[PDB]
């Protein structure tokens, strides 16, 4: 936002 999820989330936000 990139959510991608690697349970949990990873983003450069």
């Given at each position: ?6 349970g949990?989330?990873?983003?450069e936000?």
């Open positions: 936002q990139k959510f991608i999820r690697v949990v989330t990873i983003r936000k």
